[PDB]
Copies of this chain bind each other. A is one copy, B any other.
Amino acid sequence: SPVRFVKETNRAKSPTRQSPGAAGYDLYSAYDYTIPPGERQLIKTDISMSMPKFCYGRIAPRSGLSLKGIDIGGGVIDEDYRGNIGVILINNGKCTFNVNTGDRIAQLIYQRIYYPELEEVQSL
């Protein structure tokens, strides 16, 4: 079944997929931000979605931004989350990093996971 998503405002851009072999789906900033060196900023996408079962969405770095010193903080979108997906951009570069509305900021990867029951034992 398809993954449903909602645009909170008209400023949101629907996540995009360019090729059959891409790991993920492009995420875009819904707002203008400026991030000083050595600081981080939560970037709102204005996109909420119903994640697939036995999966989480990993907010993953674009390589081009990573080479510029821009890293991703947090980034775990659980299947229970119905809120605004936020990208924590960390400016580990030396200059101010500017984020404009519509800028590609990360890629969302639907990562397959397991939910085992945990059982405490005396020894393994």
Contacts and interface: CB of A to CB of B under 8 A. Distances in A.
Contact of A119 (B4, B17, B20, B122): B4
B124 A6 contact: yes
B110 A22 contact: no
Instruction: Bin the interface of chain A by size.
Output: 35 or more
| Count of identical protomers in the assembly | 3
B66 A73 contact: yes
Nearest to A70: B73
Given A42-B67, A111-B111, A117 B3 contact: yes
A35 interface: no
B75 A61 contact: yes
Nearest to A121: B4
A45 to B, nearest CB: 13
B121 A80 contact: no
Interface string A19-53: 11111110000000000000010100000111110
Interface of A: 1-7, 14-17, 19-25, 40, 42, 48-52, 55-56, 60-63, 66-67, 69, 71, 73-82, 86, 88, 90, 92, 107, 109-124
